[PDB]
Amino acid sequence: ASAYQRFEPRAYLRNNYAPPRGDLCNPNGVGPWALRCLAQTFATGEVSGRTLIDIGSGPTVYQLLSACSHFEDITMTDFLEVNRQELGRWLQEEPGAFNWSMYSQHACLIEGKGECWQDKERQLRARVKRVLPIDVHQPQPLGAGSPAPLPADALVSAFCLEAVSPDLASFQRALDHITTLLRPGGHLLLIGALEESWYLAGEARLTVVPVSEEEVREALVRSGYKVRDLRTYIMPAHLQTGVDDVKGVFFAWAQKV
Ligand SMILES: Nc1ncnc2c1ncn2[C@@H]1O[C@H](CSCC[C@H](N)C(=O)O)[C@@H](O)[C@H]1O
Ligand SMILES: O=S(=O)(Nc1ccc(Cl)cc1)c1ccc2c(c1)CN[C@@H](CO)C2
Secondary structure: OHHHHOEOHHHHHHHHOOOOOOOOOOOOOHHHHHHHHHHHHHHOOOOOOOEEEEEOOOOOOHHHOOOOOOOOEEEEEOOOHHHHHHHHHHHOOOOOOOOOHHHHHHHHHHHOOOOOHHHHHHHHHHHEEEEEOOOOOOOOOOOOOOOOOOOEEEEEEEOOHHHOOOOHHHHHHHHHHHHOOEEEEEEEEEEEEEOOOEEEEEOEEEEOOOOOHHHHHHHHHHOOEEEEEEEEEEOOHHHOOOOEOOOEEEEEEEEEO
């Protein structure tokens, strides 16, 4: 918790979204696999509506590339002021923003609608109406007077919950907490670290709750979801870089009610 105070966005970004973990050329990498999961899910046309909320966005945008064309009102969030500012830098095309163009181009490539990557980033930037502070540890994650439309038609969260929970029980609560923001029948797209206990973000050393696919599955069910899809990407040896001890990555498409 207080460890997130030393959390450096730039260090987080190069540890996870820059080579080798960031390479998108090899189809066997984690990046290609994750964008595929997201793109395919939205391609079924079943995950749709008007508003969407991204839980604990951190300083990344890749988790919304395929999503942005299905929701006109997008709300991004994060606990740390520093991450919200890193997002602004990219959203406002300000100086020193992280370059996600490779991810955009790959999203367009995977989506196969012949869209150019500039049009993709243009649309995402347009639909992101706000970058709000948030705390999944609060029964009301966003708060009282949330400028964000509620209940949202859909939610997206990547690598957040397990990274802010010390144990399985906390994980469940945080999931119950954010679940309240979702409209019954709505959809949840959850991505996270499998069996990880720590990860570095510069001077910050964060503790993580090691979870398994079945634990995630069971937790989604407990929060009142109907697991539409749950996949696992096992982390290959060469993506084991010393920035954490993650064993794999999971993708979950869950529906509320
Ligand atoms: N109590 C809390 N509630 C919500 N988010 C929190 C939190 N404590 C920390 N976080 C945020 O959770 C994130 C975990 S890292 C995941 C970042 C991004 N979603 C990605 O896919 O890479 C960080 O951005 C961190 O600032
Ligand atoms: O899968 S990754 O190795 N990198 C990646 C993810 C998605 C795309 Cl699209 C590209 C690269 C990746 C990304 C974020 C985090 C990890 C791994 C593991 N640690 C979590 C925080 O606990 C945070």
